[PDB]
Symmetry: C3
Subunit: 206 residues, 3 copies
């Protein structure tokens, strides 16, 4: 009936991602009890058979909320710049035999490290989301998001940056997500804190 056993269940991406065209880092998870399905069906219209289509890549340590949507397959065959958006080429009717293929790639959808995707946000094809970003709930993300940026609304718009500029530089330098597991245990208390200038030296001195 329901993939998730409880509303607070958070199952890792790699544990449930079966689509070969979906690339997830470890520890990233999706908690979708309230929509009933595994992460595969958050990723819409991604052919598992082909290697010419746009791919979805998600980094490590991401948190994805229930009913988030990753729209793939570009324009789905609709060319708004042609006379008609109706996709003749893909409809079965002999009257449509001379139709042209309106499908166009958008590029891959790139989801960086440590990014928080709010429940029921929708990510449009070919969006790039930088490290440490926050997509508010119900956002409709139509443009790239810069690292540690917070966006929300429909369409998604700049709300704020999580940290100061020199602080974002510091975090993208050490890139804590790339560290070995034995190392993470030790800086955990600094990670669960605001002391950005602080942890910048424990990585630097070592």
């Amino acid at each position: 009936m329901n993939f998730f056993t409880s509303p607070f269940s958070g199952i890792p991406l790699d544990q449930q991602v079966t689509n070969p065209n979906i690339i997830v880092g470890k520890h990233s998870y999706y908690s979708g009890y309230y929509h009933g399905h595994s992460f595969d069906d958050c990723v819409r219209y991604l052919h598992p058979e082909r290697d010419d289509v746009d791919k979805l890549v998600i980094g490590s340590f991401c948190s994805i909320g229930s009913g988030a949507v990753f729209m793939m397959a570009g324009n789905q065959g609709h060319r708004s710049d042609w006379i008609s958006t109706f996709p003749f080429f893909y409809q079965d009717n002999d009257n449509f035999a001379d139709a042209r293929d309106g499908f166009t790639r958008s590029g891959d959808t790139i989801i960086g490290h440590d990014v928080w995707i709010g429940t029921e946000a929708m990510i449009m094809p070919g969006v790039k989301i930088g490290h440490g970003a926050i997509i508010a709930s119900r956002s409709v993300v139509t443009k790239d998001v810069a690292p540690y940026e917070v966006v929300g609304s429909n369409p998604a718009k700049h709300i704020k940056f999580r940290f100061s500029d020199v602080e974002i530089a510091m975090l993208l330098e050490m890139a804590w997500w790339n560290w070995p597991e034995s190392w993470l245990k030790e800086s955990m208390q600094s990670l669960c804190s605001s002391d950005i200038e602080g942890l910048y030296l424990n990585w630097q001195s070592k």
Copy 2:
């Protein structure tokens, strides 16, 4: 249960619609794999047997994405201009005996030809969407949309027009969705192009004589 067998499955509306108050043109289709239900349950609160309610009318060659919503039954009995929006008339309670019917109709929801309605868009009661319009995904459409206009956001607002004013007028005179099917089969390459000028000249030489 999923009505559709694959995400790319798109069934013509006239194959799945059962509600006598839903009127759909040829070739229009709904691809609702990701919301499970067939197109009927896209049309919310439409009494299927009464003949005195707002109807949903959809033209031909329309593309409707998954979980699109068409809100019917007007204000559903809720009067914001009355002291309370609670619909006393429609709740079973002997103390609500002298309530008044707050139900108000909005008029038909009319979607024209060659309209693209994005996934999970919500159309409010009484909205008219003209030919060739595009409703971005997740739009909440609260007022009418002109021909060949693109709108999005919540509430939906103008994004752009697909073509120049002259070209829009040209397309509406041609009304290719109404052409004989032989003309449509012959024009299929032009229709999958931006060449309005050429196709309009080709139509005139066929239809002006």
Copy 3:
């Protein structure tokens, strides 16, 4: 296995809430045929066993549309002011021992009386909504809403006040939702009307000193 019988079936909240941390007033009803589930699953991430968590309080005579969402559990353990939004504390992996709890409560979500919550609206944690308010369909409510204020969009913003300042203060003072049943029953016509001042003057004469 839908919980509601027809699209028009609105079931009183007090007849379908099991979470001890959801408290509902009389006559308030949820109308959720098009999302299938009972009202409990509208209220998300609300621990039902604990009493140190944010609670949901809903006045009487509220109308709640299908698939409305009430976000509880505050920030869910994600602290945007910490270096990482990833909730180490709640991740069960062995590496994450010296993790710290990032959960922060938002305070109770409070819905006054006579509130109309449009379908598929989402109320954020800790939000208070005053009596007589209207939340438009698909609203994302991030801020408090005043009595008899109409809001909508994502995030929700002021649209209008339903009535004048005088009329609103009259309504908050007379508090018709708290009236004995017999007063409610005999005022049913006035309530299905816009004559606040007239009702106010009657309420004064029946209730003063």
